[PDB]
Each structure stands twice: as structure tokens, then as C-alpha cells.
Amino acid sequence: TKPHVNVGTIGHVDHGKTTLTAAITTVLAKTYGGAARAFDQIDNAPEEKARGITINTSHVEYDTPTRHYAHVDCPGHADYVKNMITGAAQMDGAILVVAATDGPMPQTREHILLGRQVGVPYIIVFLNKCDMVDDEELLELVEMEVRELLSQYDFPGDDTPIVRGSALKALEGDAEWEAKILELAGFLDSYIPEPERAIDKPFLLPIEDVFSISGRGTVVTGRVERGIIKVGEEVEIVGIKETQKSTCTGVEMFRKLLDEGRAGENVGVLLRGIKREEIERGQVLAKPGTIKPHTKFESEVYILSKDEGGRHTPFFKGYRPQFYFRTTDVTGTIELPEGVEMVMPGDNIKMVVTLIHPIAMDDGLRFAIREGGRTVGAGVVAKVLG
């Protein structure tokens, strides 16, 4: 069965993200068939909790001939912030809906910048409410405004598919508008490279437990985050301290020996020659040369409200919070933007972080900020720095 792609609709409020979303599910339904669905029943997005953090999120699926799509759509700007930083709704591409009327509005920019921070790799634009727009080559000088903005945060604005349409008329059933819908589904099909499967990525395993087998080496355990480890392959141990190289002489699971550990599985991996006291929980095992240890990086951080597990009072830099990456805690110091001292609950900000030791990480790694025995923040690494 088909390859799976994660999209959702992003962009400023009441520009049409929710109607577009229903229009799609309703066009492709009357076209190829399947399930159509109601604006009413999409707009009133249910609450679901990603680790204490509550987000209002509707999840719609539709099918093109070549692809299955999981579409995410949210009611408030805040939902989009929490969802994007959190990973609760990772996207292989976003549909940026801009109203023909207003032009890029304040969330338009923020949803693009946040898309870059959080590692959304492709954006496709839909100029909406065109049925409202009456004459001229504004549609054209607006398709330019959207392009400079898009290139302003590093997306190929010049190469960007921009579809003009009316989500309402398309949902009402105007055939010439049901058209730009199907045209848009073509662009998801054509412009978003089908995403790499986890089992296809280089091997990575966050280390949970470590014990010796005397006379053989040491065993480290965890859930394979991605890739395949096969018996006989070299691996590295990365983070927290000096990288080391080893060979995998075996893989076990539930007391059974295997030829390999695969993404998704909890496994033991025996490392020949390595001794116990030189591996720490918090290190990772990884295909050699595919992930590096950094101590410094740039992230986007959302400060939890009290309701979702943090504090009703603002977070102040300068107190050395704990950053939690995969399996461990490690102290860091923060630099905030210029002039800013604190971050209000429910707000998000950019943070440059310097840890006290190295952690294996690339852009897009998630993490939690703790301080005083309380999870106060959720972050994503936007760019590794050293």
C-alpha cells in the first residue's frame, strides 16, 4: 500500500486553513472516493495530550492515486506553536494558506519562520479567497510578497508552487474551483520528495542500560531509534565524552540472539573490547561518521503554562536549567535575544544553549527544559553550533 506523507495547513487566522482542509478531503472524495469531511467537524479540533502539553488538533487523511496524506489542522496560533516545536505533528511539507484579500499577515511570517526553525523541509502556497477578488494583477503582486517572505527564511521562494483557488466555492461544489483543489493535490504529489523511512536512515540507538559480559566485552541496551545494526558492523559511541569505535559482535532481544536490530525494537548489542566504565547512559550508538557531539546550539523553545506541567510564572535565564535529551539530563547555560531577560508562560522564544558536555544531536532533535524538579519548557535544536 501507498507511501505516507505528513502535511498540514499553516498560516494566519481565518485565511481559510480549515475550509481548504475540508475542501480537499471533499474534492478528492468525490473524485477518487474515500471519506469526505465536515468543516464543522474539523474546525472544532479535539484536545489530545502530548506529555502534559494539551494541543487542539484535527487530523484528516485523504488519498491521491500515488500517495496517502495525513493532514494536520489546528484552531489557534498557539496550537501551531506547541505542535511544531513539540513534534506532535511533524510535517514533510506544509501548505501555507494566504488570503488573497489581506496579504501576508503577522502569523504568515511566524508560521514560515517557525517552519524553518522546526525543520519543515517544503512549503507549498495556496492563495485563497480568490473568488472574492475582483480584477486585477494583485493576485500577481501578492504571489511576489509571499515569495520574498519565503526566501527570507531560506525556502526556494522562486521555485514555489502557488495555487490560486477558493476553498469555500470548492467546498460548496463550484466545479471550476474544485479544480484548483485537484491541482493542489498534484503539487503535494509532485513537489514533496517522499520521506525517508526510519529503517533507511543510518543506525542510531540511545543507550539505556549497560552491563559487562566478562571475557566478551560490554552490552548496551535501548530502543533502536532508526536504521539497522547488523552483527559484525562497526559503530561509534557518541556524546558526553570522547567518541570511541567498536564492532558489534551480537544482538539479543528477549534472550534470543538475532542477526540484526531494527528500528522500533528494544535490543541488546554486544561491543567487543569495550569495558563497562567507559559507556554512559546518555550516549548513543550510531553508524560511524553520521552524528556528531555538540555542546552549543540554537533552538526554538516554548515555555509551558502551569496547566501543562510548568509554572504560572516567567522563566528567567541565568540559573542553569537541565536539558533532557533522549535518555539523560545535562546542565546548560542560556543566551536569550538581546534585551530580553525572561520568557512568559505559553510564549516561545529563540535560545542559544551551551551544555556542560557534548551530546550527539543534529538539527531537529527534541528536548525538554527542567528546573527545580519541574519541566518548564519544550525545545527543538534549530542549528548546531559547535
Binding site: 552491563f211 559480559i213 552490552v219 541496551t221 559482535t249 528477549f254 540472539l257 528494544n266 541488546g268
Partner: peptide, 12 residues
């Protein structure tokens, strides 16, 4: 190793 239904564990 050490596990056997679903926790972290192993052997080699």
C-alpha cells in the same frame, strides 16, 4: 541480556 516481554535489556 535481561528483558523478556518489553523492558530495556539484553545479552550478546
Amino acid at each position: 541480556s535481561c528483558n523478556c516481554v518489553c523492558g530495556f535489556c539484553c545479552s550478546x
